[PDB]
CSV table of C-alpha atoms in Angstrom, one decimal:
chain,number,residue,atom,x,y,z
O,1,UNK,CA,-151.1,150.3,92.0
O,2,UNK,CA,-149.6,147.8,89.6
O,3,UNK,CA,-151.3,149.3,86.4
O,4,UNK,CA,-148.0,151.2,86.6
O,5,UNK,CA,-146.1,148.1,86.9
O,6,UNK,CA,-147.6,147.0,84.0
O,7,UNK,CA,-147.2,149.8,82.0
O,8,UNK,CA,-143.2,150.3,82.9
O,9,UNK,CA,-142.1,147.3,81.6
């Protein structure tokens, strides 16, 4: 779930 967190920022 942190490939969004990655792609946010």
């Amino acid at each position: 779930t942190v490939y969004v967190y990655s792609r946010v920022k």
